C-alpha cells in the first residue's frame, strides 16, 4: 500500500529536523553553561553576578516574546496542539514564520533557563520542515500530511534520542486519519530512524541515562505500582488544573504587566539557576538528578516542589516552552523518592529501588497526556532498559486511568481547544 | 475518553487468554517431548520407533483435519485473517465452536510437531475469548470490538512474552476503525499486560532468549542492514509467492487426496522430529539454535532451506497453523549465516556478530506482513535488547518496502482475500 516519492520525502525531512534538532540542543545547552561560567567568573566579588546573569537571562526571555509577537504568536508554548490542530483541519501552519521564530525565539528561551523543553520547539520546527520538505517534493494534500506528521514524531526523537516515541507519539495522542494510506507508519519509522541517526552523528550515540543492570523485578511487587499510578493519576491531574489556572491569571493582561512580563519571570528564573540545584532549565539534569547524585529526601521534596511551580509558573506565561522533558524530572524526582520509601516498607519485593525509579518516570506524561503507550517508549529509550516493563505499563496506565477518573482531560486537546479560542489572536 | 466498564472487561479478557495461552504451550510442549522420549525408549531396537513416532503424529494431524470440518472451518490456518474479517464486517465469529476446536484441534497439529506456530490458536482463542466475555458482560457494538481487537493483541502476547507486541499487532496491520473511542489503547495494553502476567506467572518470566549484553553497534555500520533488508525483502516477496501457489495445490483436491492429506503430512513431519536438528515444531527450538549453539554453516543452509519448504508445505494444507514463529526461525537461521559472513568481511564495523543476528531475526515477518513496526517491537521483547535499534529499524522497514516495491501485497490481508472466496467451503 506504499509509495516510493513519498518516503524518499520522508528521508529528508527526518534528516533536517535532525540537523535542526540535534544542532537546537548543543546551542541551546553552550548558551547555557556559557551563564553559568559567567556566573562563576564574577562571583567572588560580589553578588554582581547576581545582576549581570539577571539582565541576561531577563533580557533574553523578554526578547524571545518580543520576537513571538509580532512575528508568529503560533509559536507560544508547546508544540503537539499547534500540528494536532493543522493535521485536524483547524489552525494553520506557515513555516517561513514558524521554522526561523520558534528556533530564534525558543533558544532565547530555553537558553536562558527556562522550564523547558527541547521537545518543544524540534517538534514544530520539524512540522514545519515536513511541510518545507512537502512543497519542495509538490507531494499530494494527503501525502503533505503524513510529512508534517512525520517531521512531528522525528522533532521527539531528536529530542530524547528515542524513535520508537516519536513514532507512537502520531499513533496514540494526535491521532491523524490518513485516508487511506495506513502505511504512513512507514513514513514515520522512516522520518524517525533518520532524524536519530543524523542526532547520534552530531552528539550520540547513548542513551539519556542508561539504567541498563537493573533487571530484578519479581511478579508480587506490581502491586506497589497500582499505588505509584494512583499517586502519579492524582498528580497528572493537579498539574492540568493548575497549569489551566496559570494560563488564566496570564491571559487577563494588563497590557502593562505583559510589557515586562518576560524580563521578570526571566530575571528571576536567572537567579534561581545560579543556586547548586536541578531546579531550573530543560528538565533533562532534573532526571540525571534523581539518579543518580544522592541527595536528601528532603531536598527531593525541595527541588519537586521548586520545579513543579516553576514549570507551571513558566509555561502558563506564555513562552515558547516544551513540557515533555519537565514532566520527566518531576516525575523521576517523585518515583525516585517514592522508590526509597518503598523499598523501605518492603525491600524483599523491590530488590532493585531504580526499577520503580524507572517505572514512574513518565507517569506524570502518561496520566497528563491520556497516553501512556507513547510514554511507556519513551522511558524504555532513555533508559535502555525493557526488564521494568511490566512495572512500567501499570504505572503509566493506571497512571492515565486515574487522572481521566477525576475528569482531567488530555493537556494536548484542551491545549488545543484554548488555542483555537485565540481565533482573533 | 475512557469508559470504565470496558477496562474492567479487558482484564477479564487478557486473563482468560494468558490463562488458555499459556497452558497451551505447556501442554503443547509437554506432547512434544513425550513423543521424543517415546522415541529414544524404542530407539535401541531397531527403527521401530520409526512406526511408531510416524503413526502418533500422523494419527494426530489427521484427527486435527477431521475436528476443523465439519466442526469448524474456521479455525483452519492462522487467526490474524479471520479476526481481521470480522473486526471489519465480513466473516462471522462463534466461539462457542471456535473455541473449543481451534484448542483442541490446535493441540493435536502443534503437539505432532507441525511447522507452528502459537501465536495461530492463541490470537484467535483470544479474539473468542474477547467475545466470550463481550456478551457476559452485555457491552455494546463498538466495545465488544475492542473485545476481541483486545483477546487478539493478547494472543500475540501470551506466546511469545511480548506485550508491545499485541499492541502493536492491531495498531499497524489489522488496522480497525474505533469511533471514536480511539483510546480502545488503554483496552489493548490492559489485556496484554495482565495476558504476560499470568503467563510469567504460569512459565515466566524471563523472555524467549536474552542477548541483552551485545551493546556495541557503531554508526558506520548501518549500511549493511539495508542490504540485509533488500536479502530478506526477496525472501519475504518468495515467502508470499510460494505460500499462494502451495495453498492453490492443496486447493485443488482430490476428494480422495484429503481423506489422507491428514495422515501422510502428520507422519511425514513425525519422521523428521526424530533427526537431532530443529526442522520441525514451532519455530522457537529454530531461534534457540541459529544462536546459540554453534553449528556448520552447511547445517544452517540445509535447515533453513529444510523448513522454508516444510512451512509452506505445513501451512499450504490449511492446517491449524500460525506464521510468525516459522518465520522467526527461518528468518533468525539466515540473519545468523548472514552475520558470520558480514563479521567475516568487515569485523571493524561489526564486532559483535550477534547484533545483525537479532536486527533481521524478525524481518521476514517485517517483509511478509508489511508491519515492520510490530515486527521491531516483537524482536525487542524476545531478547530484551534495544541496544540493536538501528539496525533493527533499518533491516526491518527495508525489508518491507522492497517485499511490496517487488508488489507481494500483506500475506494477511491476501489470506483473508482467500478466506473470503470460501464464501460456500
Ligand atoms: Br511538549
Ligand atoms: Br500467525
Redesign the interface.
Known sequence: ??H?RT?VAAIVVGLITGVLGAGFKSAVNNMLQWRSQLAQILAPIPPLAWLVTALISGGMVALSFWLMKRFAPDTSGSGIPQIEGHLEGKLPLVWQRVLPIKLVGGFLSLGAGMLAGFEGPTIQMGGSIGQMTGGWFKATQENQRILIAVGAGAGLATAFNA??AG?ALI??EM?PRFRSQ??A??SL??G??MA??IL??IR??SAIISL?EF?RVP?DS?WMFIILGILFGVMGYTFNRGLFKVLDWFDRLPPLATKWKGFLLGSIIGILSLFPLPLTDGGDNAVLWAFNSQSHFSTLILVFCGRFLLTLICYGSGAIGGIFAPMLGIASIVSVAMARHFHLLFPSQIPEPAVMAIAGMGALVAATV?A??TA??LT??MT????V??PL??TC?VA??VA??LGGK?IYTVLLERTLAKQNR
Chains 1, 2 share one sequence.
Open positions: 500500500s506504499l516510493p518516503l524513535p520508537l513514532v499513533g496514540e491521532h495506513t502505511l507508519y512507514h519509522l522512516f524517525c530512524v536519530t541517526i547520534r552523528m550520540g550515540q541498563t533487571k511478579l506490581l491520556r501512556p503507550l511507556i517508549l524504555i529509550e535502555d532498559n525493557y526488564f516493563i511490566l505499563l501499570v496506565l492515565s486511568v481521566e477518573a488530555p
